[PDB]
């Protein structure tokens, strides 16, 4: 299990749906996607950082080549932070 990512081991389909279900069941307002950062946009290699906000407070941010895939990656980052599988989490104790 050591070197792998959460959605590399457990495949999901709709991270946005899972995220809104989790926020609803822990009594958090529905997230809003906003364009935090953007480079290119008209070219063939764009860069989008989409941030997911809740009550005007940032909960996640994600990069992508398109807006939709950036929003999906931000949803996955939100799921990671909410579930405790973040990259900088405490390593396993052996």
């Amino acid at each position: 299990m050591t070197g792998k990512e959460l959605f590399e081991m457990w495949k999901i389909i709709n991270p946005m749906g899972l995220l809104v279900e989790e926020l609803k069941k822990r009594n958090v307002s529905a997230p809003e996607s906003r364009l935090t950062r953007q480079s290119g946009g008209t070219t063939a290699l764009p860069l989008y950082f989409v941030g997911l906000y809740c009550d005007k407070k940032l909960i996640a941010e994600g990069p992508g080549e398109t807006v939709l895939v950036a929003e999906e990656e931000a949803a996955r980052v939100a799921l990671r932070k909410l579930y405790g599988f973040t990259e900088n989490r405490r390593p396993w104790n052996y």
Binding site: R34, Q38, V50, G51, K56, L58, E61
Partner: protein
């Protein structure tokens, strides 16, 4: 009222020195992008909406100049390579993390 660096792009950095003076303690919580600093997200009557599948075949010159204009490169990247280089290329490269 003094900061060694501006405190609005990466982290709010505070330097400190322990009482013995033997080690330096840094505190740097990340800065978050403000909501107000963000930007809102961007947004046949009688026949089918027939799928518009045209693929015009450009000859090599026009195709390469179109690709060069698209990706901001030269033509030499798009011109092909010989069998010697094609078979010298490693098709099972090593992969770390």
């Amino acid at each position: 009222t003094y900061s060694p660096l501006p405190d609005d792009y990466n982290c709010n950095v505070e330097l400190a020195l322990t009482s013995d003076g033997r080690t330096i303690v840094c505190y740097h919580p990340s800065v978050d992008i403000p909501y107000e600093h963000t930007k809102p997200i961007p947004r046949d009557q009688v026949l089918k909406t027939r799928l518009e599948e045209k693929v015009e075949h450009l000859e090599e010159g026009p195709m390469i100049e179109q690709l060069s204009k698209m990706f901001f490169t030269t033509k030499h990247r798009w011109y092909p390579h010989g069998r010697y280089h094609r078979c010298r290329k490693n098709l099972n490269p090593p992969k770390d993390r």
